[model samples]
Target: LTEQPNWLMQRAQLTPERIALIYEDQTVTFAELFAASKRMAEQLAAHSVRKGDTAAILLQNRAEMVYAVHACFLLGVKAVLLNTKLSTHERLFQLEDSGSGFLLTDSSFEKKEYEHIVQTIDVDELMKEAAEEIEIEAYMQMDATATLMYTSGTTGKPKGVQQTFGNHYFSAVSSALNLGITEQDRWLIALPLFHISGLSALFKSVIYGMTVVLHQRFSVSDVLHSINRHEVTMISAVQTMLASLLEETNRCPESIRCILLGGGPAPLPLLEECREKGFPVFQSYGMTETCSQIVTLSPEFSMEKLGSAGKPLFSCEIKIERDGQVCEPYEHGEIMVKGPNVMKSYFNRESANEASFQNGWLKTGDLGYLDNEGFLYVLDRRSDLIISGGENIYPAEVESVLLSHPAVAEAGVSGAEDKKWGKVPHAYLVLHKPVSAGELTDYCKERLAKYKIPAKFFVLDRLPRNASNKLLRNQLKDARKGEL
Candidate 1:
């Protein structure tokens, strides 16, 4: 379909009284959500934010943030969601790179001397002023851009993934078909909205008239309380999050529909415990670029095809590619995927967009193998991307930040095994001038998110290099024995 009626507005008309959000104190109905968004849209327009203008949004996943996100769609403004965990430097980089002059935030912040921003409106204040009604499109082109989320790879430079309305719609549809949406469904949104996992869940709320229970952030006690209190059906979590909750689930059996386990493969012990406790787990493999969870292992096959990402969604296709050569099932290679749910392109990244796809398949950068029966078993979340507490942390970004220090001559960052948070960043560095680990950490704290900072730092005499003199991080593990 080339066009579809605005998902939220249309759903609001059909089920105006249906509960759409449960944010702590009150339940917000669909009608209220739509009404408030329309008002927010007016305020946005009154501030000279036009339909085609891109807006940078930096806020916590609160009820106000929900209204602001919907407001963008109503005004036809493309949103560049800035990760709340990101540092000011990181956030500013995205704002300038995205060409987003308008900024929407819940609080004021230091501007760091960036001149491109035209206006930064606080949502609380924006709502205080009387709003002027603005006309919204009844039918939005499916291909029209919906949002932009930044992701990085081996290069260390972040590229904004351009997610279209069709991408979000199909991603939601594919997920619903796999998991089976129910009237009792209440998706827990502790995951950050800046990420695809949480944003996709929000889209499902309007698309399916499903209820969403929102959380400011994730906490073990908070999550358990919400699930039992709201009868929350499903939750998207990583291995560590699931493991932490196993004890709570053991103390009491959780009647929730399922837990979508992602970020990384679940340990065999963890999976065994899940099966023991009657915890329904839907293991999945997805990234920001694919919208979210293009491949999922349903509960029925959770044990039968252990460690597999199950199969691609109804709207997608995936294969393993080594070069120009396609690999046979069971032969590990780079995972490639193609689907309507996949992103349109990376914003302002022409060369990246071109290199991103092979023929029609989008290169996932992850390494995986399909069994003879077509179930995918992922070997890695790319060779370098680290998943910590379900957050995707590219080593490149951490390395780039560390390398910025004048005393640092070279930096190599990788995931160090952790009992909590799955894997935190570990670094090995060669310094031009001697620097204390604490001093180095403080430098990183200034430029990178707290989560992105390396948890352990090792001063190596020299970073290992191959015959070609390219720094080989895989060898850093071996070189650490002769650590300074």
Candidate 2:
């Protein structure tokens, strides 16, 4: 283990007969997955994919996507995983930004422009080819770049986060230590694998010699069914996903272990619901830059430390700072992290790398605080805060209260300009049933402080969300202008 072992190859040797993946009716063993990845690697090689070359992968959540990723690892090729939900223009921008010379996609994503810009190879066609001789590295350099995944670009233009083998390696190790790995652990991946949340699970399966159950798409009923049928032990989900899961059923299967929650601040009401249902909800705080969940609240403390991101992983350090000075316990400030699991840097964005990193810390730009006992309570992204009458209001807080209303299916809050108060909170809501603005306003009046309540509420069919299903709060302000 001193030499950097190729993860897939090493894992296969360690557990050749162990179940590695379950998608639909198909189950693949580690040896089978490794062989499939090798064949795919050979196909990629025939198409001129080589070491050090960057390739963009555009595919939906499927077993083939996993094969592509593992093949890239075998070939020592840096993979740029494109978000399937992005518009053509957004996708093109990322393709260009990542400088991917080849686009590996399936029949569903075939496009003339993509072919014109770069060599487009249908993954299905590649899989059909017979295996050919291709060399693979027995030992991988830990510092070598593994994947180039673009940020959701909630605030500004998206930048690729450069994740190294070491980053993913440490991330898997850290997560396993936090959650406690078991040979029987089977993780349900209903989230898109293109995102870190899902991608990290794939890495964990190999590292921990566990099983992964893949869902083509997330449906509350489908996820629930899988848990009942497959006895899935753990899952990673966003707050919205968990909220939807709660609607299907309050109870979780006995075999279900932990629901690792991240992406954004979860509403307290949702956490409370999980607690009542005996569901193990582990609150987490992480971003694309941090691999996946450098900070997570364990299930044991999920209730007592409710709303906290828990503490940082044993390998990580977290501190709160205000105006360049470290803040005391319970003092709200920017949350910063330092850990090996943190990204090396934003791909090819030297200016961004410079701006985002301070000394050795990655300034998360998220406002949060630490309790005296060291539990972390993430407040909000600084950009999403609303200030009214000299009082700071976290949009997540307002949105949480609004979500508690029975009629509200979705809620987004942003600051609206005011003549006297400088800025006031405004809400945009998607309703499950008809509810008057007056009625909702009255509902908020009782739960929230006067200034913290939204000055205006508008009903809409849907709120803007990034590919990872995080609410686009930065876009909410612009949407409010259009509504006005």
Best by lDDT: 2
Query: Each model's TM-score, in the order given?
Result: 0.80, 0.94
Name the regions of candidate 1 deviating beyond 4 angstroms.
108-116, 251-254, 381-484
Residue-by-residue lDDT tens digits, candidate 2, 1-484: 3348888899999989988899995999999999999899989999888888889999888888999999998998999999998888888888889989889888897556687677888888889897678877667777788999998856888999999888899999998888897777899998888899999988888888988999988899888888888888998888778889888885777988889998877777678879889889989889889998988897678778877889899789999998899999899999999999899899888888997899999988799999999999988888777788889999888888888888888889988789998898889888898787788879988999888888887767678897656788767755532232
- TM-score for candidate 2, please give it: 0.94
- Model 1 whole-model lDDT (C-alpha atoms): 0.82
Error of 1 at 257 (Å): 0.9
Whole-model lDDT, candidate 2? 0.86
Model 1, span 157-247: residue lDDT tens: 6789999999999999998888887887888888788878788888999999998899988889998888888888888887768878886
lDDT (CA) for every model shown? Answer: 0.82, 0.86
Off by over 4 Å in 2: 1-3, 477-484
Q: Which prediction has the highest TM-score against the true structure?
A: 2
